[PDB]
């Protein structure tokens, strides 16, 4: 629950689709910080990103948000090929219950 400019949230949401994994990862981290529920569905799509640090960052953000919608996608990410992504998912699930 943070009073954030909605135009800023839309921007970080568009950034999850950028060419630079750096931009996508940054956007995912920033969305968790903001803690808005509108970022839930676009962040769920990012849990399937080609970059291991984007997927984990999106998983940390989703846990920070605390939305139940992310439960099914986070359980899927718990079976992710990458160790950091699996650790992120485990933590995010614990930040919900």
């Amino acid at each position: 629950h943070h009073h954030t400019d909605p135009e800023k949230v839309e921007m970080y949401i568009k950034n999850l689709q950028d060419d630079s994994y750096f931009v996508r990862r940054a956007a995912a981290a920033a969305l968790g910080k903001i803690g808005d529920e509108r970022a839930v569905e676009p962040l769920i799509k990012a849990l399937k990103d080609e970059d291991r640090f984007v997927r984990s960052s999106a998983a940390y953000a989703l846990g920070e948000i605390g939305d139940e919608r992310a439960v099914e996608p986070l359980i899927k990410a718990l079976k992710d090929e990458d160790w950091f992504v699996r650790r992120a998912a485990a933590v995010a699930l614990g930040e919900i219950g």
């Binding site: 994994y21 910080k33 960052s57």
Partner: protein, 111 residues
């Protein structure tokens, strides 16, 4: 030997727009321009809010503007929330980095 410039680099305020310049970079390569800080031994946190990807020209140079923060909520490589970074005490710099890891040495910024 790629280099980096930050104009201005000293006496900054929270919200100051700085000119981030890279020279001697690899042509056509993307570089993430971000405010970083060494918050602990081997720990680097980035400001996820103000950052841009600039692509180097044929001459190996790139230029962008950056909004610097005195205080920011810091993140690690994997999207882990570190916590609040205060640049009055923490060693804050601006960095240009390619997908590899390379690029110039970060330019120290003081408030």
């Amino acid at each position: 030997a790629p280099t980096a410039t930050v104009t201005p680099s000293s006496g900054l305020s929270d919200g100051t727009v700085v000119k981030v310049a890279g020279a001697g970079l690899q042509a056509g390569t993307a570089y993430w321009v971000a405010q970083w800080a060494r918050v602990d031994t081997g720990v680097w946190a980035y400001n996820p809010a103000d950052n841009s990807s600039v692509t180097a020209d044929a001459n190996g140079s790139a230029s962008t503007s950056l909004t610097v923060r005195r205080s920011f909520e810091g993140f690690l490589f994997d999207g882990t929330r570190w916590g609040t970074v205060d640049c009055t005490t923490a060693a804050c710099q601006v960095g240009l980095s390619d997908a590899a890891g390379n690029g110039p040495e970060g330019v120290a910024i003081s408030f």
